[PDB]
């Protein structure tokens, strides 16, 4: 197993959605077929949503992210091993934009 520290870059795509780029981390030792992403609300710690991605996607766009609520994101790359180089990313959302630019 050869993983490493986080590897997620969040950015304000469009609206409240955030682009969390999955940066190809050191694979456990086998090519990843799909990425299992699970995220939840920081306020609520009793549920975990699911989001699957293609090992070639290397990115995901999440929608419906209120400006007054944060949510944790957990990336898990699934290779022949099953799961490796997981990324536990966490970040709250900023207040409603006043410049509606970024």
From Swiss-Prot:
The gene is NCAM2. This is Neural cell adhesion molecule 2. The lineage of its organism: Eukaryota, Metazoa, Chordata, Craniata, Vertebrata. The chain holds residues 592 to 693 of 837 of the full protein. May play important roles in selective fasciculation and zone-to-zone projection of the primary olfactory axons. Residues 2-97 form the Fibronectin type-III domain. It comes from the Eukaryota. Expressed most strongly in adult and fetal brain. It is found in: Cell membrane.
